[PDB]
Amino acid sequence: KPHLNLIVIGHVDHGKSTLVGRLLMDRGFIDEKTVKEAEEAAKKLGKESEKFAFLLDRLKEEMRFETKKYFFTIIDAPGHRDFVKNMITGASQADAAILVVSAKKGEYEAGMSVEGQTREHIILAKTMGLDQLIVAVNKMDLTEPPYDEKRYKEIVDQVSKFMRSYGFNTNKVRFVPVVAPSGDNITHKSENMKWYNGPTLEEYLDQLELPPKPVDKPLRIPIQDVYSISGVGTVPVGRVESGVLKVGDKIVFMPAGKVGEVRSIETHHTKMDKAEPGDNIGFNVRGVEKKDIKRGDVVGHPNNPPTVADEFTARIIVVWHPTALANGYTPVLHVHTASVACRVSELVSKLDPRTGQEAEKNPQFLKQGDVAIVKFKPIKPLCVEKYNEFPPLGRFAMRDMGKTVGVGIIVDVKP
Ligand SMILES: Nc1nc2c(ncn2[C@@H]2O[C@H](COP(=O)(O)OP(=O)(O)O)[C@@H](O)[C@H]2O)c(=O)[nH]1
């Protein structure tokens, strides 16, 4: 049963913590000590809802639940310390998201207003690649009249049109009318919204698709070493990061752009017919001059040559810097097997560390602790990919004086 990280987003007071708490109480693993104390509190008050009210506070003072197909771990939503940093470093990545939208009069409008967080979080979900966003139109009991289908449809339509106007796919976005406190249409069907003939929020979580497997992505093999075995020939060594390499395949070495053919493959001194992601292999290639192959280079199949960056844009965290970083700064970037000096060509903007939204356009310089969108221009041809396409070739460390000055995620590459 796959483990997925869930992020619950939406405007303040729309019902995020309540939904989260509802999911944990109904499908999580809260300790018996706390559970019994909650059930005890309910007794004393003589109100069933008190168990939930009690748990919510215990949760607040304090996050995993299980559905039919997955184990979900609710991670940090925006508005938190290190939110952007942890995503840049890979310390915490969101696999799925639930956008909570309040149907209550005025609340939905506030959330979708220019300054609202429904609009902000949808845009964030977009940059985060959360194409399978589940939208929980919450507080359905507070519409006028309660459980109003028209209010729900109006909201779905509006959020959907908005999503599309921002490139957000929509085909995999799912909406569900819900009531967080009671778990209506979340962990059980609602008997109050007979007009809704669709899946429960939990059922939608179980409908979530896992991301593409590296084996299904185009072949990428960062070169670690290259030898010329007497009698054998040119034999580069590297780990297959994506795709599949097979004896007889035609392959291209970038940045050189030289095509060759794979004559043999070996993992652990044992010959193989094909190599898959994760296999550290040595492969004999015919037709490519060893001169055109160096550590840091990347192999792919001719139809999908590894991207060579003329310029690339990255979201970075400045982990360490004694003074200030500015345009022209040229640290050595370590990405996959490569180590190349890259000149900071532009400081596009500083980001809010808690949210990920722009804080300042074109900062004059960056200081330790800053999160920003920066452009780099490699000093010599460098193979890199967008982190969201080929993760292993998309995260890098900026090194200087034996220290990691920063970590970055590649968001765009200019070939
Ligand atoms: N009637 C009603 N109240 C709700 C619903 N969802 C959350 N609330 C109430 O709305 C307020 C905000 O909820 P909360 O989960 O704390 O919002 P967050 O700021 O998004 O976490 C609290 O007073 C909740 O009990 C709902 O479906 N219907």
CA of 243 to the centre of ligand 1 (A): 46
CA distance 72 to 257: 43
CA distance 64 to 350: 33
Domain spanning 214-302: CATH superfamily: Translation factors (2.40.30.10)
Tokens of 68: 């039919």
CA of 179 to the centre of ligand 1 (A): 9
Which residue's CA is the closest to the ligand 1 atom numbered 23? 13
Task: Print burial letters for 334-366: b (CB count within 10 Å at least 16), e (below 16).
Answer: bbbbbebebebbebbbbbebbbbeebeeebeeb
Cis peptide, bond prior to residue 145, ω within 30 of zero? yes
Breaks in the chain after residues, C-to-N cutoff 2.5 Å: 62
Same fold across 1-211 and 214-302? no
CA distance 326 to 319: 15
Contacts of 399 by beta carbon, 8 Å cutoff, 6+ apart: 331, 332, 333, 334, 339, 405
CA distance 137 to 339: 48
Q: Is 18 in the pocket of ligand 1 (CB under 6 A)?
A: yes
CA 347 to chain centre: 23
Q: Is 14 in the pocket of ligand 1 (CB under 6 A)?
A: yes
CA distance 265 to 269: 9
CA distance 92 to 102: 27
Contact 333, 409 (CB under 8 A): no
* H runs (alpha helix) in 74-148: 83-89, 107-112, 117-127
CA distance 196 to 189: 9
CATH assignment of 307-414?
2.40.30.10
Q: Report CA-CA distances (Å) from 393 to 62, 338, 368.
A: 37, 10, 25
Test site for ligand 1: of 7, 8, 14, 18, most ligand atoms within 8 A of the Cβ: 18
CA 286 to chain centre: 39
CA of 329 to the centre of ligand 1 (A): 48
Tokens of 138: 């919450």
Place of tokens 């979201």: 315
Tokens of 320: 């360490």
**Got the DSSP string for 36-85?**
HHHHHHHHHHT-THHHHHHHHHHHHH--EEE-SS-EEEE-PPSSSTTHHH
Helix (H, G, I), strand (E, B) or coil at 218: coil
Architecture of domain 1-211: 3-Layer(aba) Sandwich (3.40)
Q: Which helix (H) or strand (E) holds 16?
A: helix 16-27
Nearest-atom index, ligand 1, CA of 139 = 27
Q: Is 181 in the pocket of ligand 1 (CB under 6 A)?
A: yes
Give bridge partners of residue 250 from the DSSP assignment. Answer: 261
Helix (H, G, I), strand (E, B) or coil at 209: coil
Q: Measuring CA to CA, which residue among 134, 131, 111, 125 is closest to residue 186? A: 134
CA of 16 to the centre of ligand 1 (A): 7
Please provide the distance, in angstroms rounded to a whole number, between the alpha carbons at the two ends of the chain: 40
CA 66 to chain centre: 21
- Residue 320 sits at the vertex; the CA angle it makes with 319 and 324, to the nearest 5 degrees, is 115
Rounded to 5 degrees, φ, ψ at 36 are: -60, -40
Which residue's CA is the closest to the ligand 1 atom numbered 19? 13
Stated in angstroms to one decimal place, the resolution of this structure is: 1.8
Q: Is 5 in the pocket of ligand 1 (CB under 6 A)?
A: no
Tokens of 18: 């309540």
Q: How many CB atoms lie within 10 A of CB 47?
A: 12
Which residue's CA is the closest to the ligand 1 atom numbered 3? 139
Helix (H, G, I), strand (E, B) or coil at 135: strand
CA distance 286 to 263: 7
Which residue's CA is the closest to the ligand 1 atom numbered 7? 15
CA of 22 to the centre of ligand 1 (A): 11
**Environment class of residue 269 by beta-carbon count within 10 Å: exposed (0-12), middle (13-18) or buried (19+)?**
exposed
Angle of the 117-127 helix axis to the 149-165 helix axis, nearest 10: 50
**Got the DSSP string for 236-279?**
EEEE--BS-EETT-EEEEETTTEEEEEEEEEETTEEESEE-TT-
CA of 184 to the centre of ligand 1 (A): 13
Q: Is 104 in the pocket of ligand 1 (CB under 6 A)?
A: no
Tokens of 304: 């999908």
Is the alpha carbon torsion for 45, 49, 53, 54 positive or negative?
Answer: positive
Which residue's CA is the closest to the ligand 1 atom numbered 9? 15
Contact 405, 319 (CB under 8 A): yes
Q: Measuring CA to CA, which residue among 6, 20, 222, 14 is closest to residue 132? A: 6
- For residue 170, is it left (φ>0), alpha (ψ between -120 and 50) or beta? left
Test site for ligand 1: of 9, 13, 179, most ligand atoms within 8 A of the Cβ: 13
Q: Is 15 in the pocket of ligand 1 (CB under 6 A)?
A: yes
Nearest-atom index, ligand 1, CA of 182 = 27
CA distance 65 to 1: 12
CA distance 96 to 116: 21
Helix (H, G, I), strand (E, B) or coil at 286: strand
CA of 19 to the centre of ligand 1 (A): 8
* H runs (alpha helix) in 180-336: 201-205
CA distance 161 to 155: 10
Contacts of 336 by beta carbon, 8 Å cutoff, 6+ apart: 222, 241, 296, 298, 383, 384, 392, 393
Place of tokens 């109480």: 25
CA of 336 to the centre of ligand 1 (A): 45
**Environment class of residue 142 by beta-carbon count within 10 Å: exposed (0-12), middle (13-18) or buried (19+)?**
middle
- Structure solved via: X-ray
CA of 54 to the centre of ligand 1 (A): 15
In the chain, domain spans: 1-211, 214-302, 307-414
Q: Is 102 in the pocket of ligand 1 (CB under 6 A)?
A: no
Q: How many CB atoms lie within 10 A of CB 19?
A: 24
| Residue type present at position 13 | D
CA of 320 to the centre of ligand 1 (A): 40
Which residue's CA is the closest to the ligand 1 atom numbered 11? 13
